[PDB]
Amino acid sequence: PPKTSGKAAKKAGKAQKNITKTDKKKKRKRKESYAIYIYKVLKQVHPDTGISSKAMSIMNSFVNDIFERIAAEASRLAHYNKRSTITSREIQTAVRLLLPGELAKHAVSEGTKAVTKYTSSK
Amino acid sequence: SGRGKGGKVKGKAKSRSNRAGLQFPVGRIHRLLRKGNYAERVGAGAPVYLAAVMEYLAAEVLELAGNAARDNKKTRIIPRHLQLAIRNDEELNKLLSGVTIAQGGVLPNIQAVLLPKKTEKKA
Numbered sequence: 001p002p003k004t005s006g007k008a009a010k011k012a013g014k015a016q017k018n019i020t021k022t023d024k025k026k027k028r029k030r031k032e033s034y035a036i037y038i039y040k041v042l043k044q045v046h047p048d049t050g051i052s053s054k055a056m057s058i059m060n061s062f063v064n065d066i067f068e069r070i071a072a073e074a075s076r077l078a079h080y081n082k083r084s085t086i087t088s089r090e091i092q093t094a095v096r097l098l099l100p101g102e103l104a105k106h107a108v109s110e111g112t113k114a115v116t117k118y119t120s121s122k
Numbered sequence: 123s124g125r126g127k128g129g130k131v132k133g134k135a136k137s138r139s140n141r142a143g144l145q146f147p148v149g150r151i152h153r154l155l156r157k158g159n160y161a162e163r164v165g166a167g168a169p170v171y172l173a174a175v176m177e178y179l180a181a182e183v184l185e186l187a188g189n190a191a192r193d194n195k196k197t198r199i200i201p202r203h204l205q206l207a208i209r210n211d212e213e214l215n216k217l218l219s220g221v222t223i224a225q226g227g228v229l230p231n232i233q234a235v236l237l238p239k240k241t242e243k244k245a
Contacts, residue, residue, distance in 0.1 A: 032144040034176070041180045046188030050198035058204045059187070063180050066217045068158075070175070075160040076230060086155070086172075087165035095175060098217050098228060103182070111174035120173045 025057065034060050041122060070094050179217075186211060 009017060016027065038059060042051065051059065073094035074086045091111075096104045114120070123129075133140055141147065146154075148169065155161045164172075190207040191199040208214060216226045229235050 032146060032150075034180075036143055036145065037177060038180055038184070041177050042184050042188070045181050045184050048197075049188040049191055051187075052198050052200055054201045055187075055199050055204055058201055059183070059199075062204060062208065062218065063176075063183055066179050066183075066214070067176050069217050069220060071155070071158070071160050072220075073230075078161060084162040085165055086161045086163075087168050088171055091168060091171050091175065100213065103213070107175050107178045110178045111171040114170045114174035115167060118170070120170055122177050 034064060037121065038063065044122060070098060073097050183208070183214060186214075 017023075019025070035056060038056070042049070070091075071086075071094075074090040077090040077093055078084060078086065088111075092108060095107050099107065133142070148164070151169070152162075152164065155164070187199050187203055187208060190203045191197075194200075194203070212226075216228070219225050221229060221231075224235050
């Protein structure tokens with residue numbers, strides 16, 4: 001609206017892009033994010049509950065690691081079949097290798113829903 | 123422009139192919155998987171299942187975190203819950219671990235971490 005941004009960042013930096021609380025915290029080579037997923041699922045389980053930006057930063061890193069660990073099993077299984085591709089076969093087994101069967105049976109059902117609704121998110 | 127907004131600008135760049143949010147496209151997923159030497163390609167339908175699994179995991183974590191936040195009479199979950207309550211859950215801790223100090227039983231490898239016997243001693 002009349003009166004536009006006077007300064008721009010692009011210059012030499014002292015500390016990391018001389019950021020002081022104004023922007024989004026960018027560090028530790030973090031690139032893009034599951035924030036959309038977490039913020040979407042959060043309100044489906046706990047709508048009245050919210051989350052701090054600090055917690056979100058750690059939460060995303062925590063939940064991501066969980067998937068990373070499962071992805072490792074996928075590569076492990078594919079290695080037995082002498083392949084380098086991830087399919088439902090690996091996913092289903094990978095989850096059952098780390099996550100208890102009681103919970104694993106819930107994950108499978110959730111996946112079936114996603115494939116039937118053709119939605120890559122809840 | 124200088125004079126004003128001559129054309130139609132909207133997003134970060136001008137292309138029909140554009141990414142609205144911080145989402146991860148198939149190409150980026152493949153790149154990450156290859157960077158970790160996990161897989162080269164993904165089967166059709168698998169990304170849909172992968173997403174569901176991820177959302178399921180997140181749901182469980184958010185359930186515990188959200189409940190814990192309310193216990194502390196907080197409207198928004200604080201980082202203290204992630205370093206305390208979330209660290210107490212054995213299920214989450216199990217999947218959050220890799221081969222290091224053995225927590226659970228799942229240690230992928232040839233034998234058990236303790237080893238069923240001793241080795242040979244030389245005289």
